[PDB]
């Protein structure tokens, strides 16, 4: 079930058994790589890049075409985000919740949800520290939070 | 039937089944009766696969014939529709009928006056005939039932999938079972039609009785 929610919804992507490139798909590996590069230049995160490629360009999954993941491709080209996208999204969600809270102080439910989001951020940051994806001194604080966005 | 051509379904049996609404099940389906239905109609009625019904009928006939003493087969019907059918079945084959009320303890109370110890049990409807079905759990009594789409299959060892709400279907089912039992036993005729017509087994309500008389 969800980490901080009582729900246990079973909803996710179901990858097909076949791992090959689709018959309809005609772009070679380099074309999809340059599409990814231009989308990253637009500023889209790898989640958005994959969504746009799947919805518009007919690629089922770029990992079956170019043989590599989107974030790996961006890191190889050197235009990857400074911090991982999911941690950044959690950071900005916590920042928005704090901004809402600092006016609505009576909002105790917002305080509870902020505690939940901060716990998720702490766990994600700890994991990314064990993987050496973040500097070991990287610390999320209530003060230097909106600057990371 | 055993895929035997001599035991295969004919056109006359199909026509009789369709005439009497045998294929017309109920609007509810038992999960253990699913293997015998074929589809659901637009009006929410479960069509019964007639080949499945024929196979179950022939299996039940094989079960009945294998009993050497015909009196040891007991045919029971509490609903008014099946009483004439089971009486005619017992007359034609030799089973022991119980029409109307079934006395609890008929099989378990060895002191009672009407205490009979059958070797096979055939009932018209497991829902209406739940008492002999439950009593068959105490005396090692295998049971054949004329089950519908909704009828439960507890203690029912050979369920024949057929309409049993209507009098015509019950009568025709009992008639065909008697016909097949007499055919495998060696009497009556397999190649040419049986003497008794199916309408002898049909139950007639007093309205039909007074209209025909």
């Amino acid at each position: 079930g969800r980490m901080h929610a009582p729900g246990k919804g079973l909803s996710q992507s179901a990858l097909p058994y076949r791992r090959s490139v689709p018959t309809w798909l005609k772009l070679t590996s380099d074309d999809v790589k340059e599409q990814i590069y231009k989308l990253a230049k637009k500023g889209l995160t790898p989640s958005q890049i994959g969504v746009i490629l799947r919805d518009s360009h007919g690629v089922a999954q770029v990992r079956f075409v170019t043989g590599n993941k989107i974030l790996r491709i961006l890191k190889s080209k050197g235009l990857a985000p400074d911090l991982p996208e999911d941690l950044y999204h959690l950071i900005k969600k916590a920042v928005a919740v704090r901004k809402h809270l600092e006016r609505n102080r009576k909002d105790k439910d917002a305080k509870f949800r902020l505690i939940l989001i901060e716990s998720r951020i702490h766990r994600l940051a700890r994991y990314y520290k064990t993987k050496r994806v973040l500097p070991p001194n990287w610390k999320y604080e209530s003060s230097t939070a909106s600057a990371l966005v | 039937s055993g895929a035997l051509d001599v035991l295969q379904m004919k056109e006359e049996d199909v026509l009789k089944f369709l005439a009497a609404g045998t294929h017309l099940g109920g609007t509810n389906l038992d999960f253990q009766m699913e293997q015998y239905i074929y589809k659901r109609k637009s009006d929410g009625i479960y069509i019964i696969n007639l080949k499945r019904t024929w196979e179950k009928l022939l299996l039940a006939a094989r079960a009945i014939v294998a009993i050497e003493n015909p009196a040891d087969v007991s045919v029971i019907s509490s609903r008014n529709t099946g009483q004439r059918a089971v009486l005619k079945f017992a007359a034609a084959t030799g089973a022991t009928p119980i029409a109307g009320r079934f006395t609890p303890g008929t099989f378990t109370n060895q002191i009672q006056a009407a205490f009979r110890e059958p070797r096979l049990l055939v009932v018209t409807d497991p829902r209406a005939d739940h008492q002999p079905l439950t009593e068959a759990s105490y005396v090692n009594l295998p049971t054949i039932a004329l089950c519908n789409t909704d009828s439960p299959l507890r203690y029912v060892d050979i369920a024949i999938p057929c309409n049993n709400k209507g009098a015509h279907s019950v009568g025709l089912m009992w008639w065909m079972l008697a016909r097949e039992v007499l055919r495998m036993r060696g009497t009556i005729s397999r190649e040419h039609p049986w003497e008794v017509m199916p309408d002898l087994y049909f139950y007639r309500d007093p309205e039909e009785i007074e209209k025909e008389e």
């Binding site: - | 035997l4 253990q32 294998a66 759990s137 299959l153």
Partner: protein, 82 residues
């Protein structure tokens, strides 16, 4: 069953359910032993042979006795392949 000498010492070997391969207890009164009359190939009459199926009361109590007997008969060739 057998001891070291090899002689069978048990009182009796009990019946096993044809549907579950489980032993049928000696006080299981719901269990049945159905005989299905074997029928000659070309005439369709009861030739004196039959197939025996022992079904435990646990299977009957849950309604699967009918499906089990149908499956056994189908595997024996009594029921045509539908």
């Amino acid at each position: 069953m057998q001891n070291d000498a090899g002689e069978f010492v048990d009182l009796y070997v009990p019946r096993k359910c044809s549907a579950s391969n489980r032993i049928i207890g000696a006080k299981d009164h719901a269990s049945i032993q159905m005989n299905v009359a074997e029928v000659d190939k070309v005439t369709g009459r009861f030739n004196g042979q039959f197939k025996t199926y022992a079904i435990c009361g646990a299977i009957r109590r849950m309604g699967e006795s009918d499906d089990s007997i149908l499956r056994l008969a189908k595997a024996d060739g009594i029921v045509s392949k539908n």
